[PDB]
């Protein structure tokens, strides 16, 4: 395909010259399928985000990881335990209220600029359900939070009776226990890019959220109209600080190689029970 | 006009019937077109409010007055000195920030029912500045008062220092005396009516406040979004109780003839200069 082989010949030709070793902290970008770790200044990373946004518009398997680190966009995490199959409504009044009441910790944490200022929720859903087993991810990616900070947002919003509800009403059965509590810390997927193993989430509603200091209690959440304008792997990169609808503001501070080879292999692998092996490994 | 002949055929041959004396507080609609004043019950107020609304939606000249009398909705006059012939920009934020404070004084004349309550607050601006005088209308139709309650209410609003900041960041150069104080007692146009002299107020933005006895901190103002499904005519009158999105929240309680034909008289007795005569009266 044109824009993998694009891809390949900007990281291989031209980004390889940003190559991280392995536990550095420069690292801002993984490449889980080549198993390669990159610091990408911002022109770099643009680049990069171009290729992958057209990568992903064609369907291509992506598995890159962005870095959150000590001062970046707010991605929260949740790993959802269903009362049936069916892919939850999830409709916008629902995400439109979880959006606020996400806000109202981000405000209760004090970090907030003062003044006039525009941040962009997107809710990416897992594709279907798989065993009762679903997830979302919120992407606050403008929102420049302290790691510290993101952990305490983070804490608060699990003991959050307004989003136990609406959860509930979705279908959650884990409403307590469903917001991973390391969403802070973990390396965050690319808009396209899944685990070898998964699907990639899909974009499925994004809102713009207006806070002034001046006038507190006027919250204003309205849908994103024109998401599909933009390069949304870009828009959604928490790391970000270039994208065009999402514009920054600044808060106070593995080896797989499945290869389409031999994956029935590893599929059969499974229904044998021989999990010991002395006289049989 | 199709419209405007229904109206005509509705007034003439149905509601005929209800016509009032002049200074009858039975009588709750003025047409002041027609000179005519009714008493219509719920029913045929309705019917009224549909064939108004037709017209409305269709530019039709109305110069229709519903009387406030004893129990009605709030409605703020606001007659507005400008720095400017520019329409002040009144966006949402500010808006918002007056319907606080006016609730503000609301809930401190003691009134309000216990329990959760929706009000709807609705802003009509005058069309364009002229000589630098501007004007909008607050309607608070659902929330019925007590007059005497609503006199109160006026005269704390009068006095309110951010609703006088919120006005002079606007351009307004009597924001101490811009209000109305009999906005309690005078006849209120009804949605899409205006003096003869005058265009009819547009609907800007309208706004949902919920307010909770047991929750008294949490005070929301969300914009109404789907304003143009409503009978608006309907919806925005102090004296309806049978509106789809305004339902009621209780609180604890001439020139005769004037058809032109000889008041042309009344038009060219102005020009002469003849105002006092001594052997000429």
Redesign the interface.
């Known amino acids: 395909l044109a824009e993998v082989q694009a891809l390949e010949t900007l990281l291989t030709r031209e980004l390889s010259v940003f190559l991280t070793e392995p536990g550095s902290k420069k690292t801002n970008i993984i490449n889980r399928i080549t198993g390669k770790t990159y610091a990408l200044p911002s022109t770099e990373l643009l680049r990069l985000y171009e290729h992958l946004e057209q990568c992903r518009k064609q369907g291509a398997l992506m598995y890159f990881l962005e870095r959150q680190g000590t001062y970046s966009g707010l991605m929260l995490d949740y790993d959802l335990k269903l009362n049936t199959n069916a892919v939850p409504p999830l409709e916008p009044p629902a995400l439109s209220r979880l959006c606020h009441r996400i806000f109202v910790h981000i405000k209760n944490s004090s970090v907030l600029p003062e003044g006039s200022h525009k941040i962009h929720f997107f809710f990416t859903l897992k594709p279907e359900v798989v065993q009762g087993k679903y997830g979302f991810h919120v992407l606050i990616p403008g929102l420049k939070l302290a790691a510290s900070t993101k952990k305490s947002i983070i804490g608060s919003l699990q003991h959050d009776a307004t989003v136990q509800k609406i959860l509930h009403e979705q279908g959650v059965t884990n409403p307590e226990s469903c917001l991973d509590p390391h969403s802070a810390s973990v390396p965050s997927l690319l808009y396209g890019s899944s685990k070898l193993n998964h699907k990639p989430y899909q974009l499925k509603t994004g809102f713009e959220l207006v806070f ?1 200091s001046s ?1 507190p ?2 919250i ?1 959440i309205h849908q994103i109209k024109n998401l599909e304008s933009y390069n949304l792997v870009s828009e959604l990169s928490l790391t970000n600080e270039q994208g065009s609808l999402v514009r920054p503001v600044y808060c106070a501070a593995m080896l797989h190689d499945p290869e389409a080879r031999y994956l029935h292999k590893i599929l059969n692998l499974l229904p044998p029970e021989y999990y010991v092996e002395y006289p049989l490994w």
């Open positions: 002034d006038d209690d006027y204003p």
